[PDB]
Design a protein around this ligand. Structure first.
Ligand SMILES: Nc1ncnc2c1ncn2[C@@H]1O[C@H](COP(=O)(O)OP(=O)(O)O)[C@@H](O)[C@H]1O
Ligand SMILES: Nc1ncnc2c1ncn2[C@@H]1O[C@H](COP(=O)(O)OP(=O)(O)O)[C@@H](O)[C@H]1O
Lengths: 92, 153, 43, 49
């Protein structure tokens, strides 16, 4: 009886150290280090999932060619200039 | 395997339940630590009484009673020393554990400070990708686009 | 009862001994400044 | 006038007594600085609606 309670005086302590490690080890699987860039980390497994859909949607509807954007700015160049140039000639 | 986005919310909620449980378990351990400390003091008080009791025990000249009282306390003296050392190891150990809990709690909320953001970027793409199947480009003239599948009908 | 005592303590940690040590340091001049000034207020 | 008889000891007790009240007054003084500005902003919302 004297010795029995001694063991119970400790058992609650060991159950605490054990759960600290288990919970702490559970951390490395979800986040770990932000620079891990590995499959294990949950964020990275989600980060690529978004990037996949980004390009997948791009192929299904290709964006305009750089020439189109280059010319589209070329057309907009005179639109402002014609108005801006005319603005000086509208009030003078 | 299920949808990964659902996995995060379920997994994160599970951890929060785990963390509070760690808080409870430590609370019980630090209590018995306190109770043992109190129990230690009580024992020496009795042994203190015997030693004080032995001081005046033989004032009549009966030196024999002194040995019995002193021999009586040595049983309690051994127990007090046994607990005294046992409470030296445990006192430092838990304080180290307390550091772990304070570390996780500070870092835990950091993850939750971000999880709501990722769930937003994900749904923007999914909804946006859903667009290309119904309309896409009006000039597509393909089966995939819903309008064209209706236009030919 | 003892369980709840420490459990509530972790959820809101008490101030560090340095804080209490300094808090008494600050209170030291508060009384002294008034007490020292009290002699100079009536003299 | 507590120590006008020369009993300087009573002075410390009275001064030590007030510091409990001094702390409370400062606690409420700051607490009434934040709330004073906040509601006035709320009053603007009601007048707007
Ligand atoms: N400072 C860093 N600490 C840990 N891992 C890093 C660091 N910088 C980059 N990494 C990358 O993160 C990965 C972490 O590995 P880990 O995710 O444990 O592998 P597993 O996917 O098998 O769990 C490594 O493969 C490593 O290339
Ligand atoms: N400017 C354009 N952008 C995209 N697709 C176009 C364009 N002009 C014509 N199309 C036609 O629309 C179709 C779009 O393809 P898509 O519907 O993604 O194929 P699927 O039916 O496999 O989804 C192409 O096959 C293409 O011939």
């Amino acid at each position: 009886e004297r010795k029995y309670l001694e063991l119970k005086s400790q058992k609650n302590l060991y159950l605490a150290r054990l759960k600290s490690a288990i919970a702490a080890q559970k951390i490395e699987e979800i986040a770990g280090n932000l620079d891990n860039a590995s499959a294990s980390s949950l964020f990275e497994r989600i980060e690529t999932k978004i990037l996949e859909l980004e390009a997948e949607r791009e192929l299904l509807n290709p964006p305009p060619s750089p020439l189109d954007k280059k010319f589209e700015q070329w057309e907009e160049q005179q639109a402002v200039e014609a108005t801006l140039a005319a603005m000086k000639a509208r009030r003078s | 395997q299920e949808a990964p986005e659902d996995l995060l919310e379920r997994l994160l909620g599970e951890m929060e339940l785990e963390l509070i449980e760690l808080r409870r378990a430590l609370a019980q351990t630090i209590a018995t630590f306190k109770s043992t400390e109190r129990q230690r003091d009580a024992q020496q008080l009795i042994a203190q009484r015997w030693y004080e009791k032995a001081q005046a025990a033989l004032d009549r000249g009966n030196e024999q009673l002194a040995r019995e009282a002193l021999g009586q306390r040595q049983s309690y003296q051994s127990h007090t020393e046994a607990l005294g050392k046992s409470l030296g190891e445990q006192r430092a150990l838990v304080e180290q554990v307390r550091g772990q809990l304070q570390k996780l709690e500070r870092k835990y909320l950091e993850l939750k400070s971000q999880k709501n953001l990722y769930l937003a970027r994900l749904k923007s793409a999914i909804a946006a990708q859903k667009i290309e199947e119904i309309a896409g480009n009006l000039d597509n003239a393909s089966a995939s686009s819903l309008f064209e599948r209706i236009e030919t009908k």
